[PDB]
Amino acid sequence: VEWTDKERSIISDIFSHMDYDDIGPKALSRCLIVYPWTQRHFSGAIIGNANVAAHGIKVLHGLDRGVKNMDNIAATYADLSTLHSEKLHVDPDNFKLLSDCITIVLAAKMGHAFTAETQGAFQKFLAVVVSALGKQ
């Protein structure tokens, strides 16, 4: 993928202003409730579950890694891809669904500051990360 500088700046800004411990748990919870079949990967209410929260937080720290290597994303997630794929058996479609929930939760937090332009750079970033995770 190719990134403009305006894109690079928006994504970077979005992440420094984001509170991972709050966005993380809300996005995963919402995904488990709106797309119920993803709940199976966590069989061991949903909004208050600490295990779901911990993984919600880990997703944001993982996306953070991608923000610091925007020009080498595919390589940055090889480990995570094999892990979710080969050892956890997470369907690749589940990444697309979780991606939309992060967008919707971030949208609810930023309000009017989540302009169309901001939505665009954020969705393109998640799209690239989703391709890398649903590859290996």
Partner: protein, 142 residues
């Protein structure tokens, strides 16, 4: 297909956001056109197609009016949206792949405007409802 729980969740949500329907329509269409460039081609006959544009503001009201109609015909969307389907398929020839894109923009819009109301429980029923609308609109395509 929508259960009684889903129908009441949508009627309930709609009684809260219905008053802002025009604003939601305007912002959703603007986002769709900016974020998904392949959609501009259908509105290129308008002289101005930017977030502020009165043409977008104007069409934004018609689209959310489509939603309001769907909400009242929620027991049978297929029948309730038949004409809107014929219109998009044969007269406007809108590629059907875009219905889900606009739905997602509407969800984003509703989330920026009513963060408190758009809970995950409301989100799932509205999402099921909007998929129903997309399915109903694709009906006359083939």
């Amino acid at each position: 297909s929508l259960s009684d729980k889903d129908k009441a969740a949508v009627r309930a949500l709609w009684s809260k956001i219905g008053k802002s329907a025009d604003a939601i329509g305007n912002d959703a269409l603007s986002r769709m056109i900016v974020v998904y460039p392949q959609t501009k081609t259908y509105f290129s006959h308008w002289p101005d197609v930017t977030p502020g544009s009165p043409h977008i503001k104007a069409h934004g009201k018609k689209v959310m009016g489509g939603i309001a109609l769907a909400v009242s015909k929620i027991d049978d969307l297929k029948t309730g949206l038949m004409e809107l389907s014929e219109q998009h398929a044969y007269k406007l020839r809108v590629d059907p792949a875009n219905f889900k894109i606009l739905n997602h923009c509407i969800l984003v819009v509703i989330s920026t405007m009513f963060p408190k109301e758009f809970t995950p429980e409301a989100h799932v029923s509205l999402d099921k409802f909007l998929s129903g609308v997309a399915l109903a609109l694709a009906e006359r395509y083939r």
